[PDB]
């Protein structure tokens, strides 16, 4: 307070251009040592303590926030505007003071927001950003400045920001952030090499916030107008939509986001340690996030852009992925994505980040093709980038730590992040092998693209040459543990992996061009089919959604396989396949409790009469179907104390979406939003007392659409098991050749078969959705 | 027989933190509350911990009523140095007690737009529209009693307001502003000069 | 190389031509320049805008010629011209006068917005002395002459807010801002002279030149972000790089044309490329960015050669953001030297640069325009 006051006497008043005063008695250096160690303890205090941080800015004699804007305001040095800098931001990150901190930031104008016509000469951030921080090369007020804005935007922000001194909204803070900041961070004169990412990451960090939380609504595609002075002004947009107009259009600030992955990647290829290494790959993350929330975005933007009034075009983003890159003259940015994944084992965080991303453009059919081109247009990148996908699946740390909750929680994070990226590339596989030939899965598969697909020689990674595959990284993961009486590790570990692994395999089996080469190379090389079969059914206790889909892949791949060989004359192989699912195999018990005795491997052939002990001998095709339970718990009804019921219902069905797999299910951060924006909509003193009840049941209501979507898709996992089930048992009656079973077996097990279904789905608990499945099965056995 | 100022501020403090508060201080919000009489707390399911806070400040300004608007100007003055939008009771109570000093408390914290919105209003209740809401016993009339206009505090926002040229709407503003004082200073003018003419007619009784 | 520029025959000699500037927030590219002629029965200011008609064909040659919007008579011939902001132009005339005229973009007209009649004039004669050069800073002016005279004005000015009086003894050729109240001026005997201009007296602040002969220098700039590198071209077409910190003498001199060196300018955005224009109607374009590939520090390889030139440099100053023009490495200052024009035109006269753009003026009466400086 002594220095503020001290510092506003000396403030000239503009009439007097005549004569040189004596040097401004400037604080000591010793002095600003102190305020600064004074100001970074009282950060550190208010950054962890609320009740500090509230106790202090509401001080009716020290009015912190107030000296500390006023002292913003006086010609102090840089370093300690950073740090009342960074104290307002410390004190922003309560909701109560950011409100007002906003209010005070718009008064004060440290940035410029009212542009009056005739001063050429601003005074504020903007111009000691380019006069005074520009000539020191370091930036620290800057840097100080977007974390303010940073913490402001995350804890409150004001839609009638400006109103009554101009248009309202966030669009000045938006334009110093781009034009000023991001856009010419490049430009600058740095004395620490660091600092050019450190300026990056915090611009950065602030435009992914806006973003992050922004939704298109109907409202941000009409011009509101609002009176200033007498003259009607067009309302500001909201920042987000900025944000995507400018990502949606060949715009500055997409070039220079692309060009910083390029630089990244291109920097990370050197495998050297250099300065704020960190920072570029966080500003690289944030560049990364921005994109893939645009993408996640796009459709509804489009959508509300062409069903309002606005003469606005906008660009899907995946088409400006393909834009020639001005500084390679070639459209290399996908292939600039895509070699992230090289440095998956030294940065799995950037990897994720560019799987997710592939990911999502891979679902757009117009692109395969083009995408197929840029990634085998040079053999050198088509292996790097073969090597980057196939590393990410290899990644054995991925499997290993799932279930140790006492370990750090960064290396919990970095093998689910390393999980996740596994679960990206293999969902890129699928839906792009959805997709018409050539494909990129295909590729990535080992399949030859400058041949028909179809007379392809896959081998064994490293015969003849070939390279390693995608193909052959999902065999390992698949083939890990079969050795073991226990079956696939996959299956245990990681079910869902397996799942999306056995369903590559499938549609590689059941696609026309693909199917001869994959199943010459998993019946030749592999003996993939048998070595698999041997260990059904998959019985997981905490997963058996997956474990079932596992299973129905596995039995359709089989299907697929026995047709074909029946078909082809195959015997030998048909056969081997027949006495695996029809030959009658000891039953191994299941029951990992049992201390109990190595004695009994000597006691001899002989006694062909009598009946008293079900030594439990029971096909494979049965057992199978054993492990298909027909019944399911129907979650109880919603008892609800506050909230409708019948609303409820409507509500959840509006928030009803098929998932990417085709099934109908309830989008739970949907319907969260809904419920909270309806809890947001009750004014009154009565709600605001209730307000922890009503966000009780809401949790009551997520929890309970949880549980019915758990229901759904077992319904449906087991309708893929049974449906999968009856396919196999359909082509081993019709396809395959009627001497391979004895007449006399071929009646008992069809017998046998008829029976169990019987009993499963007269059960009175058993799901009317199986039904037509279970009689379509009932007439092709009798 | 101590001064009531230090439970208001705190309060204020508390209804702020509450409002800038995430579900924690909600929760937190409650035991407190709980710890005051609220002769009527009915938990319907629908009031946030922050519209009881806020009910029980009402509670406390109506049971304990100061004779100089000390208690509402503490609260504004501590919500104004928050930077927290002021609820529309707080404004339409004091501005029925003290116009004038509210005018002088957001001109004090730069809110330039509603002190221009409250000389709008209070010239039309001086005009006639409106003058409940400012405790304006009767509009400006030849026989009225004299409302006390504060001319230096309104001078000051049209300085204030002219300070920033670069600023359409704060032009907008001040062009309003004083079309509206032109219509003030032409009824007074009519309404001094019919009281002139009042005075003039001679005692014939 | 001779394909990257739209060339306009106008029927007079351009003295001066100037890009409009560009809002810093569009990404909008240049598409409005003025020009000034002279030597001609009546001399002009011309306001001109590049043709862009939506060539949606990466295929199509730009054949865009630049058309004339409007124009103005001016009184004697255009010296120089700068934009004082997207509206103002500022003119020195061989009349001794400062003007100022407006654009009216609704209307496609110039009109005088101000003028000093009487801004350069020999003392004790009150005979009309030309005014060789002007600088702005919006709103500040600055015009100097052959009356070795210093004048500031503010547009919105009628009066000359102050006059620097026997500034010089000799012909004032170019003059440009150091800082917001600093001024570097150039002369007729081969001087650099700094200028305080908040300081009462008529005596530079510094005086820079030459060792040895000392020959005019016609033009003067300074690099944009490095406020103490400064750029000038003389008579004898050599292009100097100075240091106004470090000496009074150049830190580079460099064969840049067979003849009078008009003009040198920074690239405004990429300081790295500089371009300078000369009598012997040539356009050159200088590339320092070969030194901007960072230190990989990796690996080791002798060789040997020897050629001698003598500099005393001490071997003490930290290796702070070498300015690439001040870089007296000869294995790392490669730079890059391109002719812009084909061979062969008269005197080109003006040149300006802008984003991508570049504009030049010639005494072949010709106006030459490229949008893709660097493609």
Same mark, same amino acid.
């Given at each position: 307070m002594?220095?503020?006051?001290?510092?506003?006497?000396?403030?000239?008043?503009?009439?007097?251009?005549?004569?040189?005063?004596?040097?401004?008695?400037?604080?000591?250096?010793?002095?600003?040592?102190?305020?600064?160690?004074?100001?970074?303890?009282?950060?550190?205090?208010?950054?962890?303590?609320?009740?500090?941080?509230?106790?202090?800015?509401?001080?009716?004699?020290?009015?912190?926030?107030?000296?500390?804007?006023?002292?913003?305001?006086?010609?102090?040095?840089?370093?300690?505007?950073?740090?009342?800098?960074?104290?307002?931001?410390?004190?922003?990150?309560?909701?109560?003071?950011?409100?007002?901190?906003?209010?005070?930031?718009?008064?004060?104008?440290?940035?410029?927001?009212?542009?009056?016509?005739?001063?050429?000469?601003?005074?504020?951030?903007?111009?000691?950003?380019? #006069?005074?921080?520009?000539?020191?090369?370091?930036?620290?007020?800057?840097?100080?400045?977007?974390?303010?804005?940073?913490?402001?935007?995350?804890?409150?922000?004001?839609?009638?920001?400006?109103?009554?001194?101009?248009?309202?909204?966030?669009?000045?803070?938006?334009?110093?952030? %781009?034009?000023?900041?991001?856009?010419?961070? %490049?430009?600058?004169?740095?004395?620490?090499?660091?600092?050019?990412? #450190?300026?990056?990451?915090?611009?950065?960090?602030?435009?992914?916030?806006?973003?992050?939380?922004?939704?298109?609504?109907?409202?941000?595609?009409?011009?509101?107008?609002?009176?200033?002075?007498?003259? #009607?002004?067009?309302?500001?947009?909201?920042?987000?939509?900025?944000?995507?107009?400018?990502?949606?259009?060949?715009?500055?600030?997409?070039?220079?986001?692309?060009?910083?992955?390029?630089?990244?990647?291109?920097?990370?290829?050197?495998?050297?340690?250099?300065?704020?290494?960190?920072?570029?790959?966080?500003?690289?993350?944030?560049?990364?996030?921005?994109?893939?929330?645009t993408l996640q975005k796009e459709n509804r933007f489009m959508d509300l852009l062409r069903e309002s009034h606005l003469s606005m075009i906008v660009t899907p983003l995946e088409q400006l992925l393909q834009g020639i890159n001005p500084r390679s003259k070639k459209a290399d940015n996908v292939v600039n994505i895509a070699r992230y994944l090289c440095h998956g084992n030294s940065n799995a965080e950037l990897a994720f980040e560019s799987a997710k991303i592939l990911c999502s453009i891979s679902c757009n059919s117009k692109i395969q093709e083009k995408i197929v081109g840029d990634f085998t247009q040079d053999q050198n990148v088509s292996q790097k980038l073969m090597v980057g996908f196939v590393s990410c699946l290899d990644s054995e740390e991925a499997e290993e730590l799932l279930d140790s909750e006492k370990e750090a929680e960064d290396q919990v994070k970095q093998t689910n992040i390393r999980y996740m990226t596994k679960i990206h590339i293999l969902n890129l596989l699928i839906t792009s092998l959805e997709m018409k030939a050539p494909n990129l899965a295909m590729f990535l598969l080992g399949y030859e693209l400058k041949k028909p697909v179809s007379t392809t020689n896959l081998q064994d990674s490293g015969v003849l040459g070939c390279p390693r595959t995608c193909l052959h990284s999902i065999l390992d993961i698949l083939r890990k543990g079969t050795d073991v009486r226990a079956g696939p590790v996959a299956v245990w570990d990681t079910p869902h992996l397996a799942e999306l692994c056995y369903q590559v395999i499938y549609q590689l089996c059941a696609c026309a061009d693909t199917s001869g080469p994959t199943m010459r190379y998993l019946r030749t090389s592999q003996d993939f089919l048998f070595s698999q079969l041997q260990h059904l059914p998959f019985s997981v206790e905490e997963s058996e959604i997956s474990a079932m889909n596992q299973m129905s892949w596995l039995m359709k791949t089989a299907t697929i396989e026995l047709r074909i060989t029946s078909l082809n004359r195959q015997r030998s192989h048909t056969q081997r396949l027949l006495h695996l699912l029809l030959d009658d195999m000891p039953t191994r018990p299941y029951s990992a409790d049992g201390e109990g005795g190595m004695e009994d491997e000597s006691r001899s052939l002989s006694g062909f009469l009598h009946?008293?002990?079900?030594?439990?001998?029971?096909?494979?095709?049965?057992?199978?179907?054993?492990?298909?339970?027909?019944?399911?718990?129907?979650?109880?009804?919603?008892?609800?104390?506050?909230?409708?019921?019948?609303?409820?219902?409507?509500?959840?069905?509006?928030?009803?979406?098929?998932? %990417?797999?085709?099934?109908?299910?309830?989008?739970?951060?949907?319907?969260?939003?809904?419920?909270?924006?309806?809890?947001?909509?009750?004014?009154?003193?009565?709600?605001?007392?209730?307000?922890?009840?009503?966000?009780?049941?809401?949790?009551?209501?997520?929890?309970?659409?949880?549980?019915?979507?758990?229901?759904?898709?077992?319904?449906?996992?087991? %309708?893929?098991?049974?449906?999968?089930?009856?396919?196999?048992?359909?082509?081993?009656?019709?396809?395959?050749?009627?001497?391979?079973?004895?007449?006399?077996?071929?009646?008992?097990?069809?017998?046998?078969?008829?029976?169990?279904?019987?009993?499963?789905?007269?059960?009175?608990?058993?799901?009317?959705?199986?039904?037509?499945?279970?009689?379509?099965?009932?007439?092709?056995?009798? | 027989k101590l001064a009531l100022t230090s439970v208001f501020e705190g309060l204020a403090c508390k209804c702020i933190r509450l409002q800038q508060g995430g579900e924690a201080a909600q929760a937190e919000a409650w035991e407190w509350l709980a710890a005051n009489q609220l002769a009527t707390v009915i938990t319907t399911k629908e009031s946030s911990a922050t519209d009881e806070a806020w009910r029980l400040m009402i509670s406390y300004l109506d049971k304990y009523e100061a004779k100089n608007t000390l208690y509402h100007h503490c609260i504004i003055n501590k919500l104004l140095s928050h930077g927290v939008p002021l609820p529309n009771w707080l404004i339409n109570r004091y501005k029925a007690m003290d116009a004038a000093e509210l005018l002088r408390l957001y001109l004090k914290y730069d809110l330039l737009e509603e002190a221009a919105e409250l000389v709008l209003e209070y010239v039309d209740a001086l005009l006639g529209k409106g003058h409940q809401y400012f405790g304006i016993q009767a509009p400006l009339s030849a026989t009225s009693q004299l409302v006390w206009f504060p001319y230096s505090a309104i001078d000051h926002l049209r300085q204030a307001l002219g300070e920033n040229e670069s600023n359409q709407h704060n032009q907008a503003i001040l062009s309003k502003l004083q079309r509206k004082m032109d219509e003030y200073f032409q009824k007074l003018k009519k309404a001094t000069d019919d009281y002139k003419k009042l005075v003039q007619k001679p005692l014939r009784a | 190389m001779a394909d990257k520029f739209a060339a306009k025959f106008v029927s007079h000699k351009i003295s001066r031509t100037r890009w409009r500037p560009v809002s810093a927030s569009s990404l909008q590219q240049p598409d409005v320049f003025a020009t000034g002629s002279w030597d001609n029965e009546e001399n002009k200011v011309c306001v001109w805008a590049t043709s862009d008609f939506g060539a949606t064909s990466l295929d199509e040659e730009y054949q865009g010629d630049p058309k004339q919007l409007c124009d103005i008579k001016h009184p004697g011939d255009v010296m120089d011209m700068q934009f004082l902001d997207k509206e103002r132009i500022v003119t020195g005339s061989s009349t001794g006068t400062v003007t100022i005229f407006r654009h009216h973009e609704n209307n496609q007209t110039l009109s005088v917005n101000q003028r000093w009649e009487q801004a350069h004039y020999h003392v004790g004669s009150n005979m009309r002395a030309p005014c060789t050069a002007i600088v702005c800073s919006s709103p500040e002016i600055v015009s100097v002459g052959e009356d070795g005279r210093i004048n500031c004005f503010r547009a919105e000015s009628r009066d000359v807010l102050r006059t620097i009086d026997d500034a010089d003894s000799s012909t004032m050729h170019g003059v440009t801002f150091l800082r917001t109240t600093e001024i570097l001026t150039v002369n007729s005997v081969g001087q650099l002279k700094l200028w305080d201009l908040r300081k009462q007296g008529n005596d530079p602040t510094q005086i820079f030149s030459v060792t040895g002969e000392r020959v005019p220098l016609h033009c003067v700039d300074r690099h944009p972000n490095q406020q103490h590198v400064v750029a000038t071209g003389g008579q004898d077409g050599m292009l100097c790089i100075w240091d106004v910190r470090h000496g009074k003498m150049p830190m580079s001199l460099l064969n840049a044309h067979e003849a009078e060196m008009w003009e040198v300018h920074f690239h405004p955005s990429n300081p790295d490329h500089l371009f300078t224009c000369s009598e012997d109607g040539s356009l050159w374009h200088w590339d320092a960015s070969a030194d901007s590939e960072k230190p990989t520090f990796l690996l080791g390889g002798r060789s040997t050669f020897n050629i001698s030139r003598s500099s005393i440099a001490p071997p003490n100053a930290n290796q702070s953001l070498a300015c690439a023009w001040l870089s007296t490495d000869p294995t790392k200052g490669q730079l890059e030297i391109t002719n812009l024009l084909p061979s062969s035109t008269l005197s080109v006269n003006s040149l300006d640069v802008l984003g991508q753009n570049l504009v030049c003026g010639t005494d072949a009466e010709a106006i030459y325009v490229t949008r893709r400086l660097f493609s």
């Open positions: 002594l220095y503020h006051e001290h510092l506003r006497r000396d403030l000239p008043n503009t009439d007097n251009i005549h004569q040189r005063h004596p040097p401004l008695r400037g604080i000591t250096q010793r002095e600003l040592d102190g305020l600064i160690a004074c100001l970074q303890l009282t950060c550190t205090i208010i950054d962890w303590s609320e009740s500090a941080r509230l106790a202090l800015c509401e001080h009716a004699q020290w009015m912190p926030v107030v000296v500390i804007l006023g002292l913003l305001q006086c010609s102090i040095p840089p370093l300690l505007k950073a740090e009342l800098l960074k104290t307002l931001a410390a004190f922003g990150k309560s909701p109560e003071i950011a409100a007002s901190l906003w209010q005070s930031l718009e008064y004060t104008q440290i940035l410029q927001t009212v542009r009056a016509t005739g001063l050429r000469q601003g005074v504020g951030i903007e111009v000691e950003l380019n #006069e005074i921080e520009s000539r020191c090369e370091e930036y620290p007020l800057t840097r100080a400045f977007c974390q303010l804005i940073s913490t402001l935007v995350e804890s409150s922000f004001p839609t009638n920001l400006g109103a009554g001194l101009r248009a309202p909204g966030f669009e000045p803070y938006l334009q110093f952030l %781009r034009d000023t900041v991001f856009l010419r961070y %490049r430009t600058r004169a740095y004395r620490r090499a660091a600092e050019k990412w #450190e300026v990056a990451e915090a611009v950065l960090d602030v435009f992914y916030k806006l973003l992050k939380d922004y939704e298109p609504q109907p409202e941000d595609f009409v011009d509101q107008y609002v009176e200033l002075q007498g003259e #009607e002004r067009v309302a500001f947009k909201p920042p987000g939509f900025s944000l995507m107009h400018h990502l949606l259009n060949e715009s500055p600030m997409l070039e220079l986001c692309l060009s910083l992955m390029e630089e990244g990647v291109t920097q990370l290829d050197t495998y050297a340690p250099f300065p704020g290494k960190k920072h570029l790959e966080k500003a690289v993350a944030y560049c990364f996030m921005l994109l893939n929330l009946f008293d002990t079900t030594s439990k001998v029971r096909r494979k095709i049965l057992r199978i179907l054993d492990s298909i339970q027909f019944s399911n718990e129907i979650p109880e009804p919603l008892q609800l104390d506050f909230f409708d019921r019948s609303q409820i219902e409507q509500v959840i069905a509006n928030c009803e979406h098929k998932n %990417r797999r085709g099934q109908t299910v309830c989008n739970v951060k949907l319907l969260h939003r809904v419920l909270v924006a309806e809890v947001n909509a009750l004014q009154g003193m009565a709600a605001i007392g209730q307000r922890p009840l009503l966000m009780e049941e809401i949790n009551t209501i997520l929890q309970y659409v949880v549980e019915r979507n758990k229901l759904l898709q077992c319904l449906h996992a087991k %309708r893929h098991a049974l449906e999968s089930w009856r396919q196999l048992v359909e082509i081993i009656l019709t396809a395959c050749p009627q001497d391979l079973i004895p007449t006399e077996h071929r009646q008992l097990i069809i017998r046998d078969l008829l029976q169990d279904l019987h009993v499963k789905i007269l059960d009175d608990d058993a799901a009317q959705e199986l039904m037509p499945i279970v009689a379509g099965a009932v007439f092709t056995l009798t | - | -």
